[PDB]
Ligand binder design. Sequence first.
Ligand SMILES: CC(C)(C)NC(=O)[C@@H]1C[C@@H]2CCCC[C@@H]2CN1C[C@@H](O)[C@H](Cc1ccccc1)NC(=O)[C@H](CC(N)=O)NC(=O)c1ccc2ccccc2n1
Lengths: 99, 99
Amino acid sequence: PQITLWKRPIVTIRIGGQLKEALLDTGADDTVLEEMNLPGKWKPKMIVGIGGFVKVRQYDQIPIEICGHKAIGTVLVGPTPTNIIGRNLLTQIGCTLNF
Amino acid sequence: PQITLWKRPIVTIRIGGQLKEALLDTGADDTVLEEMNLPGKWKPKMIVGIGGFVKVRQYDQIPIEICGHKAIGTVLVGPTPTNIIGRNLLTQIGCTLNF
Ligand SMILES: CC(C)(C)NC(=O)[C@@H]1C[C@@H]2CCCC[C@@H]2CN1C[C@@H](O)[C@H](Cc1ccccc1)NC(=O)[C@H](CC(N)=O)NC(=O)c1ccc2ccccc2n1
């Protein structure tokens, strides 16, 4: 579908049977979810936001359903005020910006 | 244009006769550029993202050309790690997300 920008481009996501909302964020390199126990091994990572760096945990090959579209990839988990879907997964669902 | 997300959706903007690079950013409410001089009385403003708060200077009704498309709106100026074009201006240039 086409998603307009008058309000925040937030969509339903599904991950491990969890139902959540998330931002479709063309400015995020990476996908950052609020805190949750994901399976598998995680590595610590420092990522940049507008206010500075935060420490997060990187899990790989995590499947996630975005707006009825299957995606599988790297997911970062840390102290974010919002679930954020980044370019790494946005490309997988064929998302473009148009103007 | 249609812009894909395998690389950062970075474009050239023109502002105040200056050319700059900025990130097309659907997950940002606001347009935030690195420190520079703009004409006008400006309000001190605090904004927030990942890593927390940023102190910025709010300039209103600023003309800015984004990839050939003209906008006139609010530009926040401050110690952001990267220039970003947010929804306040993405909407002015008719920008949508599509998959
Ligand atoms: C998610 C992560 C991988 C860390 N990426 C980023 O954060 C990159 C970092 C880049 C380099 C530095 C400058 C910003 C760009 C773009 N950002 C993405 C980017 O799109 C980012 C995502 C985001 C959304 C919501 C909450 C937090 C963070 N937006 C923002 O930082 C902008 C700043 C603004 N006022 O416009 N934010 C917000 O719109 C915003 C909205 C509600 C909030 C509620 C509580 C706390 C913070 C909130 N921030």
